[PDB]
Curated annotation (Swiss-Prot), chain A:
Chief location of this protein within or outside the cell: cytoplasm
Subunit organization: Homodimer.
Keywords: Cytoplasm, Heme, Iron, Metal-binding, Nucleus, Oxidoreductase
Enzyme Commission identifier(s): 1.7.2.-
SUPFAM superfamilies per UniProt: Globin-like
Protein name per its UniProtKB record: Anaerobic nitrite reductase GLB1
Family statement drawn from the similarity comment of this UniProt entry: Belongs to the plant globin family.
Catalytic activity: Fe(III)-heme b-[protein] + nitric oxide + H2O = Fe(II)-heme b-[protein] + nitrite + 2 H(+)
All residue ranges annotated as the Globin domain in the record: 1-149
Swiss-Prot/TrEMBL site (Homodimerization) positions: 130
Gene3D superfamilies: Globins
Placement of sequence motif Homodimerization: 34-38, 103-115
From Swiss-Prot, chain B:
Record-given protein name: Anaerobic nitrite reductase GLB1
Matches recorded under SUPFAM superfamilies: Globin-like
Gene: GLB1
Catalytic reaction list: Fe(III)-heme b-[protein] + nitric oxide + H2O = Fe(II)-heme b-[protein] + nitrite + 2 H(+)
Ranges where the Globin domain occurs: 1-148
Cofactor note: Binds 1 heme group per subunit.
GO cellular component terms, semicolon-separated: cytoplasm; nucleus
PROSITE patterns cross-referenced by the UniProt entry: GLOBIN, PLANT_GLOBIN
Species this chain originates from: Trema tomentosum
Domain of life: Eukaryota
Transmembrane residue ranges: none
Binding site for heme b: 44, 56, 60, 90, 95
Length: 150, 149
């Protein structure tokens, strides 16, 4: 069960981090690709002009993970579940399914997300901060995974 | 290709890390599973008692460190990775068979390097990272070359 304290940690830290979301997004994908460079191959549009990490579609993907994870924290506290629109969740499940996104990709992304947050707000970092973000993310991913089918 | 410094970096760091190899091997494997817990499912003997308390984690964690250091020595001496064709064929067969993919090798590389960074911070440097990464990369390339039915 996701708590008031956890929601607060995610909501506030995101309000802080959102202020520098241009470098946050690059640091996020840099960390994903540092851990698992072959994850690049999942993105069709990455082949793109060098350095390929500049690809303009990477920023909004990174930001979407951040925004929807914070949103999940709020929903988890309020409704006790992730409440993404059924039609959006279907589109998310299908596109991640057909592009061969697997558990290890979601997991590398979680680890990269938490390292990115630690790097971005060292002064707010704590084990409860890590778990708050991590648990919100896990629930978002579980909802996407429920629609990952043909 | 592989320099005397690169070799000495891998060799000397391993000598220090080896003295605590069991603690280091466990830190290493748990780091892999912190990054990607589903990697656990590749291993028939893991996927269950808590990972942190499972002695079967020891052999594979250790073999990565030991074989990677061996690779650095072989690369300096012979210009290439010198694993016996029968051992390399078995290594290729087994990783192919269990469905190990690039991302698994890459997560392991990152975990290895983070483990070493944390274990001997006094020896850590960009060159230390490069030396271990290259010895690992060359060994991995050799295993991959035999990852076939
Ligand atoms: C919280 C988890 C995630 C969320 C909320 C999310 C969000 C999104 C969104 C909104 C799109 C569609 C954007 C567009 O159509 O332009 C998308 C597509 C995509 N995402 Fe994710 N994503 C997540 C996890 C991941 C992970 C872990 C990976 C792999 C490392 C990944 C790789 C991809 C790929 C390959 C596409 C298709 C891009 C294309 O071909 O246009 N996603 N994601
Ligand atoms: C340079 C890196 C690696 C080395 C030196 C290495 C070495 C080995 C060795 C010596 C074995 C035992 C083979 C035998 O029974 O004769 C083995 C097995 C295995 N490896 Fe690796 N490995 C490496 C990378 C990886 C990675 C990245 C994964 C995936 C996370 C992986 C997964 C497995 C699995 C599932 C087995 C079979 C279970 C076992 O016998 O322990 N290996 N590996």
């Amino acid at each position: 069960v996701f708590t008031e304290e956890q929601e607060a940690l995610v909501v506030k830290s995101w309000a802080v981090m959102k202020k520098n979301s241009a470098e946050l997004g690059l640091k996020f994908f840099l960390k994903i690709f540092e851990i698992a460079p072959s994850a690049k191959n999942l993105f069709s549009y990455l082949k793109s002009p060098i350095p390929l990490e500049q690809n303009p579609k990477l920023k909004p993907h990174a930001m979407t993970v951040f925004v929807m994870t914070c949103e999940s924290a709020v929903q988890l506290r309020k409704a006790g579940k992730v409440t993404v629109r059924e039609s959006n969740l279907k589109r998310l499940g299908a596109i991640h399914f057909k592009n061969g996104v697997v558990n290890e990709h979601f997991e590398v992304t979680r680890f990269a997300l938490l390292e990115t947050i630690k790097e971005a707000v060292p002064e707010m970092w704590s084990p409860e901060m890590k778990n708050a973000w991590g648990e919100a993310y896990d629930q978002l991913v579980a909802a996407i995974k429920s629609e990952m089918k043909p």
